[PDB]
Amino acid sequence: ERMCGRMSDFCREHKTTLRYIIWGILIAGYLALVIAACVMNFHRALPLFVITVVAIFFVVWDHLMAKYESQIARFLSPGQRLLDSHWFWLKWVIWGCLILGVILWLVFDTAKLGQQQLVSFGGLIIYTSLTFLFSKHPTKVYWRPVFWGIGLQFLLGLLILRTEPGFMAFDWLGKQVQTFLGYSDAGASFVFGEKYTDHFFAFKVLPIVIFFSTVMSMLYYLGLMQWIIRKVGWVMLVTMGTSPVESVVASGNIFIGQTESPLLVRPYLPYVTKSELHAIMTAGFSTIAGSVLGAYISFGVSSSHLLTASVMSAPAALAISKLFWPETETPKINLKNAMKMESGDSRNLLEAATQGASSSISLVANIAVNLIAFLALLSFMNSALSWLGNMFDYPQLSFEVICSYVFMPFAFMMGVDWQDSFMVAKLIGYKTFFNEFVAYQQLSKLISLRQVGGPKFVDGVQQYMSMRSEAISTYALCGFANFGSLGIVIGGLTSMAPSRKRDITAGAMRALIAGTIACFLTACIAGMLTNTP
Amino acid sequence: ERMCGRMSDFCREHKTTLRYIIWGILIAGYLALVIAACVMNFHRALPLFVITVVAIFFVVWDHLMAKYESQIARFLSPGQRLLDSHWFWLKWVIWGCLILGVILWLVFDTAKLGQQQLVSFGGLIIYTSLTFLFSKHPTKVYWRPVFWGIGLQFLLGLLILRTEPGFMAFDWLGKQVQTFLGYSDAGASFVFGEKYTDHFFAFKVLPIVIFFSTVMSMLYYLGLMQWIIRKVGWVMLVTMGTSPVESVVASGNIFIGQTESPLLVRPYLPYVTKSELHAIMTAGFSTIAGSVLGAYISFGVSSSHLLTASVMSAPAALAISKLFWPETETPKINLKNAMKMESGDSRNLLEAATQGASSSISLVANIAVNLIAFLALLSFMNSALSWLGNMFDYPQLSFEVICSYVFMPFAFMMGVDWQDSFMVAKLIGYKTFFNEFVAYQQLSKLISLRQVGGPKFVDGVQQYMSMRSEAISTYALCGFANFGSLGIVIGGLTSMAPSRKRDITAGAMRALIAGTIACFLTACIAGMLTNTP
Amino acid sequence: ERMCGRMSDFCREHKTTLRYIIWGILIAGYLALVIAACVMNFHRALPLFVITVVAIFFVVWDHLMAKYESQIARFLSPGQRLLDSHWFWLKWVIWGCLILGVILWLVFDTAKLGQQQLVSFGGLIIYTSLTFLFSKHPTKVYWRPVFWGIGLQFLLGLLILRTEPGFMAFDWLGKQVQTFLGYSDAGASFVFGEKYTDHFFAFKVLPIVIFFSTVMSMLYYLGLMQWIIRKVGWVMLVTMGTSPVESVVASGNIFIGQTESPLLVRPYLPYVTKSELHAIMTAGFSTIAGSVLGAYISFGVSSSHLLTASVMSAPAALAISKLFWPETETPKINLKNAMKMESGDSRNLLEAATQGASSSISLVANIAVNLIAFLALLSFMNSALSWLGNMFDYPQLSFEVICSYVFMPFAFMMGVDWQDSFMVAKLIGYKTFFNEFVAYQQLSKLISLRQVGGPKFVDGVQQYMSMRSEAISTYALCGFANFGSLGIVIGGLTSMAPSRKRDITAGAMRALIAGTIACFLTACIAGMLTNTP
Ligand SMILES: NC(=O)c1ncn([C@@H]2O[C@H](CO)[C@@H](O)[C@H]2O)n1
Ligand SMILES: NC(=O)c1ncn([C@@H]2O[C@H](CO)[C@@H](O)[C@H]2O)n1
Ligand SMILES: NC(=O)c1ncn([C@@H]2O[C@H](CO)[C@@H](O)[C@H]2O)n1
């Protein structure tokens, strides 16, 4: 096999040029398809052209930043020095302008919108004040992250809610997800037959969770998920001044669950501080995963609001975490170590899909069993309370009634009107004691009732509430924060960092409370920008 | 935060009084609700008053025993010394009176009831004699536990079967369980839709198992389960004279499965003797769990008889275990170590519920798969036997026919009449080779046939049997003793005590046989007290 | 208990004779039943007589070989020496006769059958040549296994396809399996109700997998599976000259999956060579398991062809493995060590059934989830391609179209006609990127369409293809070779042999390719013997 040896030697000699040429040919073929499509018809091929353009722009941008990082940093340095020199007096001017802007916005927009929006702003202040009073180290508070996190939420809300471009963008983004979740019906129909709709939740909704988990694993293998995570984490790190580890985890928890987001930084967990560990747990409790997003949309919950809430939950989580548990130690991990995220042990795309599918088995099983147990307990509790309430000739006592009268102040501070605050309080109670699947199920019921158009009151009982209240409830309920999740979060994090078991347990409860506050903070910002129809 | 530090110092200074006062206020509030309910109406609030009274009585009782244990023991000592002094002659009088009482009961009650009850008593003697002949150490038999265990069963049967108070109490207790298992329909309806009744067993019965497992975990967290276990174990220990470890496990196996009852004593397993290890396995094989109780009731099996059999199975298990495998060593574990039972790692009630729910996944999955395999094998075996039986012009040969002609003597000794003994033998065969889900399914069929009222014989084949025979079959089938369970029992116990693998394997088969004998012993006692309608 | 001690002493003294006599009595009873059945009627009892006769023959044969092995080997030795002496010249005569026979068969049978059969023979040559060119060590090729493996396939095909006895035998064997898979309906009906047919695949097909897995475990406990494996492995070892380890694994992969066949040789995995490890993986990828056989038959795929393909896949796997990755080291494991296969830790038959049932849980769960994900991805890909294809006014672009135009040459070489080659290529694509459940589902659709008798072309689109093409597709698709299975195969084999992780990864890709080639080789042989109707 002398010829074979010569071929092997030739391949070894010019390995780099051979593969580079092959990739170049593939790129040229793709560009040829794009240009030909535009030539035949442009209006029909516009989205393909747009996707190609943005991809080219980002690839060129990333290459330039990597290659010319030193030159750009040196070029920026003189301006930074000048700003540092004049900052001692310029800080008052900047702060005064920002305060004036906030005042003007309240006077000319919030007051015009109505009283409820002002109450939302007041609740935002009150929640922040309460977090300060009950802080771990009230004296040792670094206020830069708190203000920046709130400001970033306010800017995101303005761009996505009060501007036609952002409103259109997220409405389009939500509609694509709604289209994407319909593909799972093909697999559900075969496995469970054409009668799979006889059992809606089990045979139609859970397959959506399976399909999304598969896609998320495929994206992780390709590396797009990390690409977005790094881009977002840099913004939060630069503006807020947080540690790289917590910034990366917060950015990654937008798309990933509480139990799989810390895996983005596994080696460095033993060396993190208590504050960073608290922030990690807080971020997990203040967000949802991309696998369960489709199920909530299938119920009837707005896709745009869910996406907006998930994005806004990261800066709030870090801001509340820093205020609730500030940093009193020296961080050890650096930016390069945090940003590098180890992809899984998948040789090819299809193997990644199988791994994602297999992981979804325990996910759906636990979801189904937990729902069965919780609803069974709820029915038992309601029957028992009715039995106890009949002694005083009040047989209507129920878990809902107690929660409505208990969690009412929390909803009123978020800007919900007096009548609907009692209805939102029930959803808050469902989320706090059970999981958020129950709360969104009840919320979907109310949304459907309103869309039907039936009477708003029957026998003196309110049947549905306003559209604005539904939006606020959507933001407040977007989280994995429940008393039950405390144990599994602790167990998983100890399994990843056995040496830090003592520290993990200490901050878990504070993190669980911080996550709920962060969700409420997002709801307050949504409430003060939405209008009363 | 000087004020915060002062508040923290104040809380630390009087931590004990602060929490005690809070608990006192809660207790006062509960009492205020109870008294107010009684004032408004007494007949309507009676059960709440009763529950409060018994709870107060037990709390006071437990506190007094804990505080005044030494004084009470010293007060009792003189009487014990006097009894010991006169016991050498007083033992004959007591034994003679007990023998005379047994004779009188047989003559004036059993003979009046009929021949079958006398046969039940004879079978009770015969089973005990057979256990003695095939004992491990026939010479080294301690007869106190054997007689006390049988006597306790006889007293329990008299109080629960032949007295209006006990009969009413357990009928009421069974009805509450029947009400309790209906709450799972709320969760089943949502997960599996309103058509969940199209698939009865999978979508309605298994959720009952999930719900009960959840409740059992919640009770274990609160500590009620241990409270009852200690109370029962003390009675068996004091009367029978068994070791604390086996007494606790036997009392706990009334409510818990064979594989989770030994966890009540995990640390001390390596130090137990062979006899105690045999008793532990025997108790597991002679009882059922509280999670599968609802499924059996859903089939149609009597709730009262199931509860009565579960209670009566513990003294029988210990009695047969001691006789079959008596003690020839010195026990090491003491009472205080055995009674202390380590609760699970659950921070709150809701976390306990989630843990109980998660554990039920493997339970229902194994149940469903095992049933599919066993019934498929049963159909294959019956077809093969019919194929083989046709050679001799007898195509009716089947697994049922062989079992009916094989296990008939065991049922006749339990007091079943000649005609129905062949029908009970089939159920015994189903339980021995398959699990007890199959046997109870067949028993429910027969119960439904009788309740319908159709012909008792069609084409010369008996369709159903008497009510008394159904009760006896209910007692005999209440156990986890099957050839398949031998492996999983050994594996789980080795996993808990790796060093004792050699001892565990040796006694597993004897324990499996002892459990079946104990179940038969309970059935014999039930048969000799029930009447022929 | 002096009598008991005497009985124990008597049992110990003559333990061997006591159990031997008991077994003899049981054998005599069985023979009495057989003879009596024949006496009453012979034609009705014929199959029982046949089974008894063959069992007796094999038992006697095995005993004689074990006892008289040395004498037989010595008796054969002189002939072997004489053949070795004259082999230097006799080899040319034997080889020439074999070549002449092949030529005569082609001229007088293949040419008569038609052109397509000749193309199948050409494809067989071409696939072998390609494996030679891309071999790991082309110079160090041992050609004995390659020719013997192909020859054994040719002989098996002749006996099973072109002879009435073999054709009848495998048709009968397939029909028995079809009867055997109907027994699972008994368990499915109870667990999932009488409406279990509303969801065909989940509630009827998967239980078949559960039932077969249970039966396979029971057979493994009894030892029949090993008995057949040794008999087949000896034939392949003697004729082909392969190592005992790979021969045993190849014979065992006919009945067992890729992940459980290596367990037949667990201790010796660290000591195998690279070539043997490659052969093990190749055999796993070139065969299916007996648990999934029923599901494929339920779809509508021929049982006889599936059995024939599974048998023919072992010699092909070894032949291709040796050619693709020949041996350049010295094997260490011997025949006695390889043949001894350690049965599982099952005390009795029923425990084995439970263990087999439990293992099937993960099997069916992974199957269902993988199918849901793959079909969902397929729908998404097709929609995306249609969206991209509309730019060029070609909205019919799809995964099927691309695969049809890509994998066409592979199907044409196997002997499929021009029109049907494009249809077979789609099935090949489904098997390569997804699993073989999808491909067989599509194949069953085509088979049903043909059996209906509808038009073969509608709107110029072929709806179904010939019966011969369906057979060829059946042979080509019989394998577990897919890109996704690569990871799980590597993980399982590393878990069994941790030290060989580096070697396992290197040969996995070559093994995956070899398995597909082996499946194609079987299809080519089937194509050249089947006739065009
Ligand atoms: N991808 C994940 O990690 C995930 N998804 C769902 N849940 C759990 O399911 C519950 C309800 O959806 C949540 O509270 C979580 O505890 N976890
Ligand atoms: N809670 C438990 O431990 C449990 N419950 C059921 N089973 C098993 O399920 C089988 C039939 O119910 C029993 O024989 C047991 O082996 N075990
Ligand atoms: N018994 C087994 O080992 C088995 N059975 C099925 N599969 C997997 O299921 C997939 C489709 O059946 C195959 O590719 C295998 O990867 N494995």
Ligand code: NA
């Ligand atoms: Na999240």
Ligand code: NA
């Ligand atoms: Na949130």
Ligand code: NA
């Ligand atoms: Na039990």
Ligand code: NA
């Ligand atoms: Na029992």
Ligand code: NA
């Ligand atoms: Na196989």
Ligand code: NA
């Ligand atoms: Na194959």
